[PDB]
Amino acid sequence: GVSKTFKDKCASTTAKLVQSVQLVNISSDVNKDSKGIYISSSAGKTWFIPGGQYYPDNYLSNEMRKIAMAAVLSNVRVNLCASEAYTPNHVWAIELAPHHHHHH
Amino acid sequence: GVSKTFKDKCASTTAKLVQSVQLVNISSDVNKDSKGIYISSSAGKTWFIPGGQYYPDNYLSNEMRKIAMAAVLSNVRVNLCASEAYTPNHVWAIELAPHHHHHH
Amino acid sequence: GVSKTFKDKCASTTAKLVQSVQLVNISSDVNKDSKGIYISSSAGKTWFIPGGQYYPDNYLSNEMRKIAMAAVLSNVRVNLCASEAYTPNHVWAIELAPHHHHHH
Amino acid sequence: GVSKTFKDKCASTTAKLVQSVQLVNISSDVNKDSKGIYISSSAGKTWFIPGGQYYPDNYLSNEMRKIAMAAVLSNVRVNLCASEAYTPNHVWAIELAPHHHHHH
Amino acid sequence: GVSKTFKDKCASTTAKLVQSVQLVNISSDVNKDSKGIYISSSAGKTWFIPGGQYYPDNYLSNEMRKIAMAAVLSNVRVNLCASEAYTPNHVWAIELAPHHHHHH
Ligand code: NA
Ligand code: NA
Ligand code: NA
Ligand code: NA
Ligand code: NA
Ligand code: NA
Ligand code: NA
Structure with missing residues (x-):
C-alpha cells in the first residue's frame, strides 16, 4: 500500500500521487533527442524518470x-509522485509497494 | 536474528536498537525539500536513510x-540502529536478518 | 508488449524497432579490437550495446x-531500437517487456 | 566447496582459511566509531569486511x-580468508561456494 | 549455447574459446600479492578476470x-575467451549462456 510519509511528501508538491501502479515496461534510450528512462503501466500511461548529475x-x-x-521484473506495485507539466509526466518520487494480505 | 556485534555497536551510541522489523515500503524522492530515502514498517513507522558524499x-x-x-522486495526482516533525535528517525546502521528455523 | 512511447521514440530515429526479442546470450569483451557488450537472440541475431563515458x-x-x-537471466522479452548502420547493429534503446496475460 | 586456488591464495598469507560458512547477517554501519561492513555466521562468529578507496x-x-x-539473501555458503590480527577478524578474501551434489 | 559472434571474436584473438563451463566458485581477494577476481569450474579449472581502471x-x-x-549464483553456463599465456588463464570475454531446450 502507500505510506503516510509518501502521501505527505507528494501533498507538499505540485506533483500528483498515483497509487498501486503495475509497471509492465522499463526502457533506457540514448537516442540524440529522446534520451532517458521511461516506465509504462498496465493501463498504457508512460512516465519519465529524471537523472541526476550531482549529489544527492x-x-x-x-x-x-x-x-x-x-517492480517490472518482479511484477510488484509502486506509488508515484508525478508532475503533469511534462510529456511524458516526470517522476519526482517512487515507492516500492508490495501488496501484503492482513487476515484479521 | 540479531548479531551480538550489531547489538554491541548500537549500545556504543545514543541510537536505539529496533529488532525484527518487516519493511513493506522503500521510497526515493528528488522533490526540492523532501529529498532522500525513506523506509516504512508493517506497523506504520518510518525511518530516513542518510546518504554519504565522501568515503567511507x-x-x-x-x-x-x-x-x-x-528486505522489502524479498519480505526479509532487518535490525536497525536509529536516532530518535530526528523526525523521521534516522538509520545509522541496518542488518539483514533472514529468519532461520533451529529445530533442537 | 511494446509501449506506444517506445514506438514513438523509435519512429523519431533512423534506428528500426524490433519487437518481442528473446535474448539468450549477453557478453562483455575486453579484447583489443572487439571491446564492448554484445547480445544475441534465439533466432541468432547479434547487437552491440554502446557504452557512455559522460552524463547522461x-x-x-x-x-x-x-x-x-x-532479460537473458530471467528469459524475459525486450523491444529494441537498433541502427543497421553498424556491424553488429547498435542498440540505441531497449525496453524490458515481460509478457502479461489479459483474460477479458 | 572450496577451489584449490582459494586455498593456495590463503596459504600464501598469515590469514586463516574458514570453509563452508553459512552467513545469516550482513550489516552496514555509518556510526562515528563503528563504521563498516560486518557479517555473522550461523555459529555466531563475526568478521569485518574492509573497504577500498583506490583502484583496485x-x-x-x-x-x-x-x-x-x-550469501545471506540466498542462504548460500562462502569460504573466507580472515586475519586473526583483528577482533573482529578482517576478511582479505571471500569465495561464493554454493553446495553442489556429486552422486558418483 | 554459444553465439556465432562470440566464437568469431575469440577466433580473431590469441585467446582460446571454452564452451559450456559451469562456474561453481567466484572469489574477490584484497591480499597484497593475490589481489583480483578468480572463477572456478565444476571440473576444477580456474581463471582470473582482469580489472579496468579507465573507460571502457x-x-x-x-x-x-x-x-x-x-552464473555461480543461478547455476547457469558461460562461454569464455581465455588467454593461456597466464596461469591462471586470463578471461578476455565472457558470455552468459543459459541452456535452452529446442523441441523441433
Ligand atoms: Na501533490
Ligand atoms: Na503531461
Ligand atoms: Na544504543
Ligand atoms: Na525508426
Ligand atoms: Na548492420
Ligand atoms: Na595462511
Ligand atoms: Na583464438
Missing part, C-alpha cells in the same frame, strides 16, 4: 531506477 | 540502501 | 546493460 | 560485499 | 564480474 540527485535517481526495474 | 559513508550508505531494498 | 549516456548505457542482463 | 581495492571490496550479501 | 575497461570488466557472479 545522482544516488537518489539511481534508487528510483532500481525500484522501477524491480 | 558513500559506499556504506549504498550498502544500507541495498539491504533495505532487498 | 554513462547511467543510460548502464541501465541498457541491466535490462539486457535481466 | 575499491572494486575488489565492492565484489566482496556483493558475494557476502548474496 | 572499467564498465566492461564490471559486466564480466556481473555475468560470472550470476
Whole structure:
C-alpha cells in the first residue's frame, strides 16, 4: 500500500500521487533527442524518470531506477509522485509497494 | 536474528536498537525539500536513510540502501540502529536478518 | 508488449524497432579490437550495446546493460531500437517487456 | 566447496582459511566509531569486511560485499580468508561456494 | 549455447574459446600479492578476470564480474575467451549462456 510519509511528501508538491501502479515496461534510450528512462503501466500511461548529475540527485535517481526495474521484473506495485507539466509526466518520487494480505 | 556485534555497536551510541522489523515500503524522492530515502514498517513507522558524499559513508550508505531494498522486495526482516533525535528517525546502521528455523 | 512511447521514440530515429526479442546470450569483451557488450537472440541475431563515458549516456548505457542482463537471466522479452548502420547493429534503446496475460 | 586456488591464495598469507560458512547477517554501519561492513555466521562468529578507496581495492571490496550479501539473501555458503590480527577478524578474501551434489 | 559472434571474436584473438563451463566458485581477494577476481569450474579449472581502471575497461570488466557472479549464483553456463599465456588463464570475454531446450 502507500505510506503516510509518501502521501505527505507528494501533498507538499505540485506533483500528483498515483497509487498501486503495475509497471509492465522499463526502457533506457540514448537516442540524440529522446534520451532517458521511461516506465509504462498496465493501463498504457508512460512516465519519465529524471537523472541526476550531482549529489544527492545522482544516488537518489539511481534508487528510483532500481525500484522501477524491480517492480517490472518482479511484477510488484509502486506509488508515484508525478508532475503533469511534462510529456511524458516526470517522476519526482517512487515507492516500492508490495501488496501484503492482513487476515484479521 | 540479531548479531551480538550489531547489538554491541548500537549500545556504543545514543541510537536505539529496533529488532525484527518487516519493511513493506522503500521510497526515493528528488522533490526540492523532501529529498532522500525513506523506509516504512508493517506497523506504520518510518525511518530516513542518510546518504554519504565522501568515503567511507558513500559506499556504506549504498550498502544500507541495498539491504533495505532487498528486505522489502524479498519480505526479509532487518535490525536497525536509529536516532530518535530526528523526525523521521534516522538509520545509522541496518542488518539483514533472514529468519532461520533451529529445530533442537 | 511494446509501449506506444517506445514506438514513438523509435519512429523519431533512423534506428528500426524490433519487437518481442528473446535474448539468450549477453557478453562483455575486453579484447583489443572487439571491446564492448554484445547480445544475441534465439533466432541468432547479434547487437552491440554502446557504452557512455559522460552524463547522461554513462547511467543510460548502464541501465541498457541491466535490462539486457535481466532479460537473458530471467528469459524475459525486450523491444529494441537498433541502427543497421553498424556491424553488429547498435542498440540505441531497449525496453524490458515481460509478457502479461489479459483474460477479458 | 572450496577451489584449490582459494586455498593456495590463503596459504600464501598469515590469514586463516574458514570453509563452508553459512552467513545469516550482513550489516552496514555509518556510526562515528563503528563504521563498516560486518557479517555473522550461523555459529555466531563475526568478521569485518574492509573497504577500498583506490583502484583496485575499491572494486575488489565492492565484489566482496556483493558475494557476502548474496550469501545471506540466498542462504548460500562462502569460504573466507580472515586475519586473526583483528577482533573482529578482517576478511582479505571471500569465495561464493554454493553446495553442489556429486552422486558418483 | 554459444553465439556465432562470440566464437568469431575469440577466433580473431590469441585467446582460446571454452564452451559450456559451469562456474561453481567466484572469489574477490584484497591480499597484497593475490589481489583480483578468480572463477572456478565444476571440473576444477580456474581463471582470473582482469580489472579496468579507465573507460571502457572499467564498465566492461564490471559486466564480466556481473555475468560470472550470476552464473555461480543461478547455476547457469558461460562461454569464455581465455588467454593461456597466464596461469591462471586470463578471461578476455565472457558470455552468459543459459541452456535452452529446442523441441523441433
Ligand atoms: Na501533490
Ligand atoms: Na503531461
Ligand atoms: Na544504543
Ligand atoms: Na525508426
Ligand atoms: Na548492420
Ligand atoms: Na595462511
Ligand atoms: Na583464438
